Amino acid sequence: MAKTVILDHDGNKDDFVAMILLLSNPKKVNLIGCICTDADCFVENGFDVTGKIMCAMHRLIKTPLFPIGKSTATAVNAFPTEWRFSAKNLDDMPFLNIVEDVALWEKLKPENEAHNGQQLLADLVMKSKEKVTVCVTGPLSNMAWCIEKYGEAFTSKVEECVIMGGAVDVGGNVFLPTTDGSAEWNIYWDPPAAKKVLCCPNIRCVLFSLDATNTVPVRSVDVKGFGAQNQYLLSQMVGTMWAMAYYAWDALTAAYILEPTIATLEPVALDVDVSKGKSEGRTPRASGEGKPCVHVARNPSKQMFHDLVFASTRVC
């Protein structure tokens, strides 16, 4: 039986590859909702792409419809505006404009526009029959909000939280005149939120930091393989998302949910930098002999990842 999952994402290309991996595998995953944050997207576009993917899968493979909520979380440190257009472009793609999916999403949008993302995440987790696995591919703001508001009433219902973020033993990816390059973007967008979640004693966290993700490159040679499966809508989707160095990033979180044996898990105590200095957002190893915060993913299987993505994208 399927794991109960919520995808808490921020609407860039890799977020949607993650969504597709989860939604295309109903034998393993029951996707009960999605949250979209105004981080590496413009939230209205991320919301619409989420809706249309949901509608396409409902049509093709009969996965249930689910609630989708826009978070009202605001950036501590915003993503570069230029990067945030990915969902806008995706929303114009022919594979996201099949007439039946556009028509159904028009009908479903009003009810979903009404949801508050943070409250939806809380409600879905707290009202769920089984414990919920939360896949976090944007910043940690929504998880933090839930922990702050509800504490153990929320955390007791989380099976595990699988997170794309941080950089432990390698450099970061936040390169700005005001930064040193040690921080990773998802953490940097809201460092206090990351500190609240990663160091929370009552949540089992698995962290896909740049350490693991940057060992799984997405290369042209790999991407070209979707052409042989162009008959499948999901191959049109993922092949285009990847064709638009580049790593698997957010997609590895969903891959781990599908197949936890994709990676080694190493316990590490982290100390999230919430200062306003050059190292803001850094997730270094904590000094001293403190209780580890999280399992950090190590040396994920490139082969298992490839096999999983290519199989998933032949589903429809």
What does the alpha-carbon distance between residue 307 and residue 291 come to, in Å, rounded to a whole number? 36
10 binds Ca ion (CB under 5 A): yes
220 binds a copy of itself (CB under 8 A): yes
Please tell me whether 14 is known to bind a ligand.
yes
Give 7 or 87: the residue with its C-beta nearer to a copy of itself: 87
Verify whether residue 137 is a known catalytic residue: yes
Taking the complex as a whole, the smallest distance from the CB of residue 6 to a copy of itself amounts, in Å, to 28
Structure tokens belonging to residue 109: 């949008």
Taking alpha carbons only, the member of 5, 259, 2, 260 closest to residue 132 is: 5
What does the alpha-carbon distance between residue 167 and residue 23 come to, in Å, rounded to a whole number? 28
Please tell me whether 137 is known to bind a ligand.
yes
Angle between helices 302-312 and 13-23 (to 10 degrees): 70
145 binds a copy of itself (CB under 8 A): no
Query: 15 touches which of a copy of itself, Ca ion, none (CB within 5 to 8 A by kind)?
Result: Ca ion
Angle between helices 117-127 and 141-150 (to 10 degrees): 60
Radius of gyration of the chain (CA): 18
Taking the complex as a whole, the smallest distance from the CB of residue 14 to Ca ion amounts, in Å, to 6
Q: DSSP code of 297?
A: E
Give 10 or 48: the residue with its C-beta nearer to Ca ion: 10
Taking alpha carbons only, the member of 26, 38, 99 closest to residue 64 is: 26
Verify whether residue 186 is a known catalytic residue: yes
Task: Enumerate residues 224-253 that contact a copy of itself by CB under 8 A.
Answer: 224-230, 235-236, 239-240, 242-244
Give 217 or 290: the residue with its C-beta nearer to Ca ion: 217
For residues 285 and 269, the answer to whether their CB atoms sit within 8 Å is yes
Please tell me whether 48 is known to bind a ligand.
no
Please tell me whether 10 is known to bind a ligand.
yes
Please tell me whether 91 is known to bind a ligand.
no
Verify whether residue 15 is a known catalytic residue: yes
37 binds Ca ion (CB under 5 A): no
For residues 296 and 207, the answer to whether their CB atoms sit within 8 Å is yes
Taking alpha carbons only, the member of 198, 190, 290, 302 closest to residue 255 is: 302
Interface residue list for Ca ion (CB under 5 A): 10, 12, 15, 137-138, 250
Interface residue list for a copy of itself (CB under 8 A): 88-99, 102, 220, 223-230, 235-236, 239-240, 242-244
Binding residues for Ca(2+): 10, 14-15, 137, 250
